[PDB]
Amino acid sequence: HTIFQKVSVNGADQGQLKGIRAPANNNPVTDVMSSDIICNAVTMKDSNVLTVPAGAKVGHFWGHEIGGAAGPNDADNPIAASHKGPIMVYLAKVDNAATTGTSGLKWFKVAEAGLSNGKWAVDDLIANNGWSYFDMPTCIAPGQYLMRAELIALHNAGSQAGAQFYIGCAQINVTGGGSASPSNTVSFPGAYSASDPGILINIYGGSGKTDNGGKPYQIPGPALFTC
Ligand SMILES: [Cu+2]
């Protein structure tokens, strides 16, 4: 149970919920065919569009509740340690990131982390105090994008619709950059199936721990767009 609530650009905190499309609470989306899978069930947004240089180190911050409603003492902040799973970021080119609707966009993946050497992306998130990072591709065309950030908690993912999707979107404007417009994109909903090997999955191993039995974890969705 967590909410995407801030972006940082090369270390500069952009502000609490600034440029963020956010849900009313920290409950997961569990229906991958719902429009909620795009940017969550959005109940607040603003007209701010964050400036993001191509090539910049982008941080996305997750907290158990909105801002002050989650404290440094909370064992489930940024998220409960049990909630093992991957963290991903997608972009979609839009006309105006502040005014665009979210249906029918063409999404491409720019970052993902799953399971490696016994450690999940969520473990990194906890180690880094609620922040997850990626480098904005250098070659991407400048301008308005929606940035979809996603954390999938898999501690109850062995059952249908048991995977817990924590999602939000940020409104961004990429500066500098190149001319790349990814030819292969995906739809939300559409990109995920409830039967995907990284969504319908029992992550508990031989000794009952969340180690996925040491097996490779297949992060849902497409290959990364790269420069
Ligand atoms: Cu939870």
Q: Which sequence spans correspond to the domains of the chain?
A: 1-227
Query: 94 CA to middle of ligand 1, Å?
Result: 31
- C-alpha of residue 106 to centroid of ligand 1, in Å: 29
Alpha-carbon span 176 to 149, nearest angstrom? 22
Q: Which two tokens stand for residue 80?
A: 């409960």
Please report, for residues 16, 32, 91, the alpha-carbon distance to residue 188 in angstroms, rounded to integers and kept in the order given. 26, 8, 12
| Contact yes or no for 182/204 (Cβ under 8 A) | no
**Residue 208 CA to its chain's centroid (Å):** 27
The domain made up of 1-227 has a fold known as Coagulation Factor XIII; Chain A, domain 1 (2.70.50)
Closest by alpha carbon to 67, among 2, 118, 8? 2
d(CA 168, CA 63): 12
60 is in an annotated binding site: no
Residue 22's closest CA among 65, 75, 70, 83? 65
Quote the ligand 1 centre to 176 CA distance (angstroms): 38
Annotated binding residue at 145? no
Q: Provide the token pair at 126.
A: 């906890």
What residues are neighbours of ligand 1 (ion), with CB under 5 Å?
1
CA 106 to each of CA 93, 156, 216: distance values in angstroms, whole numbers, following the listed order: 7, 30, 28
**Residue 189: is the preceding peptide bond cis (ω within 30°)?**
yes
Distance from residue 206's CA to the centre of ligand 1 (Å): 24
Q: State the DSSP code for 180.
A: B
Ligand 1 centre to CA of 130 (Å) is 14
Cα(156)–Cα(144) distance, integer angstroms: 36
User: How many whole angstroms from 128 Cα to the centroid of ligand 1?
Assistant: 19
Pairwise CA distance, residues 4 & 180, whole Å: 27
Let me know the angle formed at the C-alpha of 28 by 6 and 38, rounded to the nearest 5 degrees.
70
CA dist., res. 123 & res. 135, Å (int): 19
Resolution, given in Å to one decimal, reads: 1.6
- Determine the distance separating the centroid of ligand 1 and the alpha carbon of 223, expressed in angstroms: 27
CA distance 201 to 199: 6
Between CA 68 and CA 5 the distance in angstroms is 12
CA–centroid distance, 217 to ligand 1, in Å, is 20
Largest CA distance in the chain: 51
Annotated binding-site residue? 64: no
Phi/psi at 123 (5° precision) = -65, -40
Instruction: Kindly give the distance from the C-alpha atom of residue 1 to the centroid of ligand 1, in angstroms, as a whole number.
Output: 3
Cis peptide before 78 (omega within 30 of 0): yes
